[PDB]
Amino acid sequence: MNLQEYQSKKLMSDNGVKVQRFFVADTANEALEAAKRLNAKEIVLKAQILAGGRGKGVFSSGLKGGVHLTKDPEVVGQLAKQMIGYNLATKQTPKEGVKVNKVMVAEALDISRETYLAILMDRSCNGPVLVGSPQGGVDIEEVAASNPELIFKEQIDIIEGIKDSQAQRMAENLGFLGPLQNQAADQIKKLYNLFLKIDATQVEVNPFGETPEGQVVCFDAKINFDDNAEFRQKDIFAMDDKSENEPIENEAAKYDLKYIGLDGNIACFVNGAGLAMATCDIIFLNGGKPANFLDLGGGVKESQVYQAFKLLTADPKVEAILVNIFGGIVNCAIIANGITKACRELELKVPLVVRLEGTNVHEAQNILTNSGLPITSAVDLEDAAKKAVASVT
Amino acid sequence: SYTASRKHLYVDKNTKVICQGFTGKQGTFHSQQALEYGTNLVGGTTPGKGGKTHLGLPVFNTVKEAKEQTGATASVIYVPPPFAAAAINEAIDAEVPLVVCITEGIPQQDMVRVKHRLLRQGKTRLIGPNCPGVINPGECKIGIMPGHIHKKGRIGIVSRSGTLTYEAVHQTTQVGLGQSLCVGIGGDPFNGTDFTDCLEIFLNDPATEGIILIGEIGGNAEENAAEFLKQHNSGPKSKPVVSFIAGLTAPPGRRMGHAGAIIAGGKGGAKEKITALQSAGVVVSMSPAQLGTTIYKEFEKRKML
Ligand SMILES: Nc1nc2c(ncn2[C@@H]2O[C@H](COP(=O)(O)OP(=O)(O)O)[C@@H](O)[C@H]2O)c(=O)[nH]1
Numbered sequence: 001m002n003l004q005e006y007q008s009k010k011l012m013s014d015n016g017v018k019v020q021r022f023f024v025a026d027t028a029n030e031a032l033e034a035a036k037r038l039n040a041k042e043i044v045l046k047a048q049i050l051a052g053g054r055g056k057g058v059f060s061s062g063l064k065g066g067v068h069l070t071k072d073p074e075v076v077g078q079l080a081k082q083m084i085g086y087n088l089a090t091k092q093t094p095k096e097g098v099k100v101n102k103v104m105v106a107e108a109l110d111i112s113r114e115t116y117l118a119i120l121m122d123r124s125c126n127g128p129v130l131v132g133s134p135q136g137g138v139d140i141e142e143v144a145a146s147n148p149e150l151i152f153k154e155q156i157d158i159i160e161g162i163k164d165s166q167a168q169r170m171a172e173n174l175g176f177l178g179p180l181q182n183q184a185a186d187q188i189k190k191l192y193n194l195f196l197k198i199d200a201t202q203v204e205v206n207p208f209g210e211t212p213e214g215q216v217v218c219f220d221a222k223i224n225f226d227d228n229a230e231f232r233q234k235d236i237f238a239m240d241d242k243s244e245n246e247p248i249e250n251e252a253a254k255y256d257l258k259y260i261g262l263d264g265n266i267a268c269f270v271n272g273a274g275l276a277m278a279t280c281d282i283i284f285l286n287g288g289k290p291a292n293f294l295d296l297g298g299g300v301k302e303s304q305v306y307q308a309f310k311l312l313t314a315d316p317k318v319e320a321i322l323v324n325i326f327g328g329i330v331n332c333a334i335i336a337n338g339i340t341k342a343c344r345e346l347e348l349k350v351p352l353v354v355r356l357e358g359t360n361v362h363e364a365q366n367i368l369t370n371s372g373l374p375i376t377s378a379v380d381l382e383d384a385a386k387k388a389v390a391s392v393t
Numbered sequence: 394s395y396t397a398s399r400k401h402l403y404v405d406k407n408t409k410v411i412c413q414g415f416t417g418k419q420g421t422f423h424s425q426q427a428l429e430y431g432t433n434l435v436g437g438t439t440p441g442k443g444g445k446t447h448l449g450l451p452v453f454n455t456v457k458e459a460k461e462q463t464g465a466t467a468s469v470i471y472v473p474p475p476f477a478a479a480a481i482n483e484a485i486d487a488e489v490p491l492v493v494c495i496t497e498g499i500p501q502q503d504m505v506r507v508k509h510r511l512l513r514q515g516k517t518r519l520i521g522p523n524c525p526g527v528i529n530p531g532e533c534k535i536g537i538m539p540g541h542i543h544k545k546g547r548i549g550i551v552s553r554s555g556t557l558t559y560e561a562v563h564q565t566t567q568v569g570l571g572q573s574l575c576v577g578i579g580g581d582p583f584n585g586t587d588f589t590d591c592l593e594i595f596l597n598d599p600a601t602e603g604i605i606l607i608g609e610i611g612g613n614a615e616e617n618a619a620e621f622l623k624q625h626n627s628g629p630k631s632k633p634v635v636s637f638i639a640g641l642t643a644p645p646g647r648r649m650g651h652a653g654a655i656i657a658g659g660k661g662g663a664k665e666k667i668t669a670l671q672s673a674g675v676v677v678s679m680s681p682a683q684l685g686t687t688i689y690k691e692f693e694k695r696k697m698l
Pocket residue numbers: 020044051052053054055056066067069107108109110111137206207219220
């Protein structure tokens with residue numbers, strides 16, 4: 001899960017992390033007034049979308065850039081009016097990026113040195129890790145490629161927690177000289193602890209900087225939250241608005257359906273995660289255009305089936321559905337019913353292809369065969385794949 | 394130390410198994426069936442019912458007791474997410490040679506702490522969390538997989554997806570090849586057993602003549618594995634290995650049904666995984682539907698049929 005920047009910032013603030021003063025607003029005028037209340041040398045306008053690279057993106061309104069520096073509050077409002085409502089397309093969003101409904105108006109600061117610092121559960125040390133680079137402002141992947149030695153890591157023992165030894169040593173590595181050096185250290189200890197507190201899989205600050213005034217500041221942040229931790233981060237998950245989600249998916253989650261909309265015509269719902277990915281795969285390989293990926297989670301239930309069939313069809317971009325389910329726990333029969341029972345109550349008008357296998361095979365093939373419905377039966381996933389494709393030519 | 398516990402991954406007819414969260418909806422359901430398959434389920438657990446009975450079986454208070462009273466060499470966990478973590482350490486404390494956590498949804502941080510405890514000991518070997526479990530066609534079944542589709546045989550299977558394993562199991566029985574041991578390592582980013590823990594076993598198990606590896610986007614478990622194969626499965630007496638990685642078409646930054654299936658910050662993509670495994674002489678199927686025939690051909694190319 002991901003929260004907006006102003007949400008992340010408050011959280012980091014509430015936990016002793018030096019962020020920049022800011023106010024949130026959802027209109028061009030609030031933005032203006034917000035620039036006034038701040039009252040500072042320079043202001044910073046930042047569209048609030050979960051994506052990154054905003055400061056290099058482009059709004060649909062024609063505006064270029066998601067982060068704008070200006071000393072004049074009236075400009076803040078003029079720029080805002082170009083952010084509020086439009087679509088921002090950063091190098092990390094789709095083609096039409098995301099629609100912005102809120103903007104952050106914060107106090108700019110001067111940046112002497114820019115450094116990249118981040119904490120994450122590393123799938124190599126199977127533990128928390130500190131990842132710093134004295135070269136900030138840039139996308140990390142890059143710096144890595146371009147100059148590996150410029151990267152510094154430090155495995156933190158999840159039971160001992162971070163140690164000055166580590167913190168200070170990282171601070172040194174980041175470039176923070178003498179006096180400042182210990183400030184960056186304290187801050188890094190802050191991030192780690194905040195990181196653990198909020199069950200975050202990662203907290204990324206870029207730049208983790210230094211001002212001329214000699215202040216260590218997290219000028220930007222990106223926190224990814226471990227979804228499996230919602231049950232003990234109730235307050236943090238309440239802030240997840242679910243506004244930037246593709247219209248559809250929201251619906252699916254209402255019936256606990258793992259939906260992930262792609263850009264295709266051949267919708268398809270499968271049970272089990274891997275088969276879900278596998279089906280998109282085998283579809284694309286055969287010139288297909290997976291319209292999505294759906295996962296009926298653990299077990300199924302005529303409810304889900306129908307529901308799953310309703311979301312998929314409500315989408316006018318679909319020209320076929322590829323059902324691929326492996327009857328393990330719940331036999332294929334109970335699945336077949338949910339399918340046929342839905343085709344009728346849904347009066348679907350898209351060529352449907354179904355591929356069943358496992359417990360109760362033969363029986364469920366009759367449940368379908370019988371219904372007299374236009375259900376195309378495939379022999380395996382290859383079969384289902386290729387056929388599901390022609391059905392949209 | 395912990396690598397010494399790989400040995401425990403090979404359950405068999407001798408494996409006596411207990412269930413944690415025994416009287417729960419899941420524990421109960423998969424236990425009635427764990428029986429019907431032929432698994433030696435000797436009892437289960439739940440706080441405050443020590444002495445009682447469930448499914449005609451005993452219900453102890455502690456994993457500790459249950460083991461010392463049934464001699465169970467294994468334990469399975471179906472418990473809800475907020476308690477699966479505790480459930481594992483409890484098995485670890487009671488030193489149960491084998492622990493299989495099925496539960497999906499355990500906070501990652503919790504798993505990191507478990508891995509910490511875990512790696513500094515060799516009595517307990519963990520499978521999971523968020524996995525189907527493990528099965529020795531005919532002799533033992535710990536988990537939630539459809540036992541009947543399996544048939545004792547030669548192919549050794551290790552995978553990060555359950556449904557994708559079933560696909561594989563189905564395919565190697567159609568071709569009449571059968572499975573030696575199937576280990577579903579999980580869909581989470583931090584678990585107690587990886588591809589190499591199993592490749593290690595397969596390679597030294599005479600019963601396993603071939604191996605099917607099933608991975609997907611996310612992490613680098615597939616990569617470390619491809620490395621290992623190059624080092625340990627090269628030579629004349631090398632066993633054939635067929636694989637299929639899932640997610641060649643997944644959009645970045647998205648969690649694909651599996652907390653661990655996600656390409657992030659440039660890492661996790663499927664193509665590297667296929668390029669790496671191939672470098673280690675792994676024969677990769679480009680279709681999840683060709684797992685069966687592919688490995689069938691490999692055994693063929695070596696008159697191993
Ligand atoms: N001078 C100055 N620049 C800033 C400030 N805040 C952000 N920026 C710059 O705005 C640029 C784009 O915002 P960014 O942090 O990249 O968010 P992103 O584009 O979504 O990744 C960054 O490269 C920063 O250097 C600030 O307070 N003062």
